[PDB]
Design an enzyme around this catalytic site. Structure first.
Site, PDB file in Angstrom:
ATOM      1  N   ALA A  89       0.875  -1.170   0.000  1.00 37.10           N
ATOM      2  CA  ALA A  89       0.000   0.000   0.000  1.00 37.10           C
ATOM      3  C   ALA A  89       0.921   1.232   0.000  1.00 37.10           C
ATOM      4  CB  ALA A  89      -0.871   0.006   1.245  1.00 37.10           C
ATOM      5  N   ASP A 132      -9.682  -5.354  15.824  1.00 38.54           N
ATOM      6  CA  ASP A 132      -8.595  -4.439  16.142  1.00 38.54           C
ATOM      7  C   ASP A 132      -8.529  -3.354  15.053  1.00 38.54           C
ATOM      8  OD1 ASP A 132      -6.398  -3.556  17.698  1.00 38.54           O
ATOM      9  OD2 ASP A 132      -4.957  -4.969  16.850  1.00 38.54           O
ATOM     10  N   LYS A 134      -8.534   0.218  13.361  1.00 35.95           N
ATOM     11  CA  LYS A 134      -8.037   1.543  13.749  1.00 35.95           C
ATOM     12  C   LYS A 134      -7.289   2.118  12.534  1.00 35.95           C
ATOM     13  CE  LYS A 134      -4.081  -0.741  15.614  1.00 35.95           C
ATOM     14  NZ  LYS A 134      -3.680  -1.603  16.749  1.00 35.95           N
ATOM     15  N   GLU A 136      -4.386   2.990  12.000  1.00 36.41           N
ATOM     16  CA  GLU A 136      -3.050   2.475  11.791  1.00 36.41           C
ATOM     17  C   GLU A 136      -3.122   1.171  10.956  1.00 36.41           C
ATOM     18  OE1 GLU A 136      -4.532   4.163  14.487  1.00 36.41           O
ATOM     19  OE2 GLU A 136      -3.194   3.774  16.184  1.00 36.41           O
ATOM     20  N   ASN A 137      -4.299   0.541  10.950  1.00 38.09           N
ATOM     21  CA  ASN A 137      -4.558  -0.708  10.214  1.00 38.09           C
ATOM     22  C   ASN A 137      -5.173  -0.496   8.836  1.00 38.09           C
ATOM     23  OD1 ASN A 137      -3.602  -2.535  12.085  1.00 38.09           O
ATOM     24  ND2 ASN A 137      -5.609  -2.742  13.093  1.00 38.09           N
ATOM     25  N   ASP A 150      -3.727  -6.322   8.972  1.00 38.42           N
ATOM     26  CA  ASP A 150      -3.564  -6.697  10.386  1.00 38.42           C
ATOM     27  C   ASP A 150      -4.664  -7.618  10.857  1.00 38.42           C
ATOM     28  OD1 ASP A 150      -2.241  -6.579  12.952  1.00 38.42           O
ATOM     29  OD2 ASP A 150      -3.633  -5.012  13.620  1.00 38.42           O
ATOM     30  N   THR A 162      -6.474  -2.112  20.513  1.00 38.67           N
ATOM     31  CA  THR A 162      -5.999  -0.802  20.961  1.00 38.67           C
ATOM     32  C   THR A 162      -6.975  -0.129  21.901  1.00 38.67           C
ATOM     33  OG1 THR A 162      -4.721  -0.430  18.954  1.00 38.67           O
ATOM     34  CG2 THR A 162      -5.287   1.507  20.249  1.00 38.67           C
TER      35      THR A 162
HETATM   36  C1  LIG Z   1       0.700  -5.174  11.448  1.00 41.42           C
HETATM   37  C2  LIG Z   1       1.865  -4.123  11.595  1.00 41.42           C
HETATM   38  C3  LIG Z   1       1.913  -3.710  13.106  1.00 41.42           C
HETATM   39  C4  LIG Z   1       3.177  -4.740  11.260  1.00 41.42           C
HETATM   40  N1  LIG Z   1       4.299  -4.028  11.265  1.00 41.42           N
HETATM   41  O1  LIG Z   1       3.317  -5.952  10.968  1.00 41.42           O
HETATM   42  C5  LIG Z   1       1.641  -2.865  10.740  1.00 41.42           C
HETATM   43  O2  LIG Z   1       2.120  -1.752  11.147  1.00 41.42           O
HETATM   44  N2  LIG Z   1       0.943  -2.867   9.567  1.00 41.42           N
HETATM   45  C6  LIG Z   1       0.683  -1.714   8.746  1.00 41.42           C
HETATM   46  C7  LIG Z   1       1.968  -1.095   8.152  1.00 41.42           C
HETATM   47  C8  LIG Z   1       2.923  -2.123   7.510  1.00 41.42           C
HETATM   48  N3  LIG Z   1       2.268  -2.939   6.537  1.00 41.42           N
HETATM   49  C9  LIG Z   1       2.048  -2.598   5.238  1.00 41.42           C
HETATM   50  N4  LIG Z   1       2.356  -1.355   4.799  1.00 41.42           N
HETATM   51  C10 LIG Z   1       2.169  -0.952   3.522  1.00 41.42           C
HETATM   52  N5  LIG Z   1       2.467   0.269   3.067  1.00 41.42           N
HETATM   53  C11 LIG Z   1       3.082   1.284   3.687  1.00 41.42           C
HETATM   54  C12 LIG Z   1       3.701   2.226   2.837  1.00 41.42           C
HETATM   55  C13 LIG Z   1       4.378   3.344   3.360  1.00 41.42           C
HETATM   56  C14 LIG Z   1       4.446   3.515   4.758  1.00 41.42           C
HETATM   57  C15 LIG Z   1       3.840   2.581   5.653  1.00 41.42           C
HETATM   58  N6  LIG Z   1       3.909   2.690   7.000  1.00 41.42           N
HETATM   59  C16 LIG Z   1       3.511   3.689   7.787  1.00 41.42           C
HETATM   60  O3  LIG Z   1       2.946   4.687   7.294  1.00 41.42           O
HETATM   61  N7  LIG Z   1       3.743   3.660   9.117  1.00 41.42           N
HETATM   62  C17 LIG Z   1       3.428   4.732  10.000  1.00 41.42           C
HETATM   63  C18 LIG Z   1       4.654   4.791  10.923  1.00 41.42           C
HETATM   64  C19 LIG Z   1       5.166   3.319  10.955  1.00 41.42           C
HETATM   65  C20 LIG Z   1       4.399   2.608   9.811  1.00 41.42           C
HETATM   66  C21 LIG Z   1       3.157   1.468   5.106  1.00 41.42           C
HETATM   67  N8  LIG Z   1       1.644  -1.821   2.641  1.00 41.42           N
HETATM   68  C22 LIG Z   1       1.314  -3.072   2.977  1.00 41.42           C
HETATM   69  C23 LIG Z   1       1.505  -3.521   4.282  1.00 41.42           C
HETATM   70 BR1  LIG Z   1       1.068  -5.298   4.657  1.00 41.42          BR
HETATM   71 CL   LIG Z   2       0.390  -5.940   7.906  1.00 40.86          CL
END
Ligand SMILES: CC(C)(C(N)=O)C(=O)NCCCNc1nc(Nc2cccc(NC(=O)N3CCCC3)c2)ncc1Br
Ligand SMILES: [Cl-]
Length: 276
Positions: A89, A132, A134, A136-137, A150, A162
């Site tokens: 994403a 869960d 939110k 952030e998910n 998630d 959360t």
């Molecule tokens: C389930 C969990 C906790 C994990 N790390 O396994 C999780 O955070 N899932 C969503 C994000 C990772 N997964 C995923 N993230 C993205 N894309 C994406 C692209 C750019 C940035 C971020 N991340 C953020 O914006 N963040 C904000 C600050 C830290 C992350 C995430 N695509 C598919 C997945 Br599966």
């Molecule tokens: Cl994920």
């Protein structure tokens, strides 16, 4: 097809870090495709007694085939780790836009709220409770459409999500259901419009006290139709939340005056409104 290996990829930056996983950006050498690879360490999974949750998650991600959810393309494992190749994403977490832009205007709030409701309708239709949900998910793809993820903690038809989006039933008879997801949507709708979650306090025990007592207020800025909708979701009695089976499902929810102009049938085909 080809069973993938770590060497088949060129890994990059970290996209997210959970307690049991790390999602890393990987580029497939043979196609140049980018994937968000979730990496789990078998040891930590076992010692932390998580097998039930890792199995669950992959098994839910197998049953889902809809545009508002992150897709699972392949899996593979090495000596000490499990790897899930997921949809990358591009735009990341929805929480960033909320913080970035402050809060959302009514058009954006309604379009994004409609995508969430459409995704919940699908999920609830397979008998899966996210448990869960939110900001952030909820991720945003290259086109700013939502892509929910998630699912380790989902319930297919124990834990507590959360602190701010947890519903009353969990804090009481500790049992969640489809309405638990609707409670989180109300919280999230409020958060989109106000820029802030509705039940908040210096500590978790305090957040819990408010929730059970339904202690929260609506800012004067709040669009009235959004507000009416939020009061129909933020209900202690789960059998009374707009959207649940006892309230006759998604038809009545979708028919809310807040959604008056929505065209539910092809949302992902629609051009999302510019976040400002
Ligand atoms: C389930 C969990 C906790 C994990 N790390 O396994 C999780 O955070 N899932 C969503 C994000 C990772 N997964 C995923 N993230 C993205 N894309 C994406 C692209 C750019 C940035 C971020 N991340 C953020 O914006 N963040 C904000 C600050 C830290 C992350 C995430 N695509 C598919 C997945 Br599966
Ligand atoms: Cl994920």
């Amino acid at each position: 097809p080809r069973k993938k290996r770590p060497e088949d990829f060129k890994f990059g930056k970290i996209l997210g870090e959970g307690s049991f996983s790390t999602v890393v950006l990987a580029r497939e050498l043979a196609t140049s495709r980018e994937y968000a690879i979730k990496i789990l360490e078998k040891r930590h999974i076992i010692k932390e007694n998580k097998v039930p949750y890792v199995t669950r998650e992959r098994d839910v991600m197998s049953r889902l085939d809809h545009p508002f959810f992150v897709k699972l393309y392949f899996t593979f494992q090495d000596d000490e780790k499990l790897y899930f190749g997921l949809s990358y994403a591009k735009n990341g977490e929805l929480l960033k836009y909320i913080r970035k832009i402050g809060s959302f205007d009514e058009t954006c709030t309604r379009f994004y709220t409609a995508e969430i409701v459409s995704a919940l309708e699908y999920l609830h239709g397979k008998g899966i409770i996210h448990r869960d949900l939110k900001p952030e998910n909820i991720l945003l793809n290259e086109d700013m459409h939502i892509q929910i993820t998630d699912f380790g903690t989902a319930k297919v038809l124990s834990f507590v999500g959360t602190a701010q989006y947890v519903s009353p039933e969990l804090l009481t008879e500790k049992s969640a259901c489809k309405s638990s997801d609707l409670w989180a949507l109300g919280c999230i709708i409020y958060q989109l419009v106000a820029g802030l979650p509705p039940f908040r306090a210096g500590n978790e025990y305090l957040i819990f006290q408010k929730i059970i007592k339904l202690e929260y207020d609506f800012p004067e800025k709040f669009f009235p139709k959004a507000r009416d909708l939020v009061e129909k979701l933020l209900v202690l009695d789960a059998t009374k939340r707009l959207g649940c089976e006892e309230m006759e499902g998604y038809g009545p929810l979708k028919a809310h005056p807040f959604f008056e102009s929505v065209t539910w049938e092809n949302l992902h085909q629609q051009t999302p409104p510019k976040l400002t």
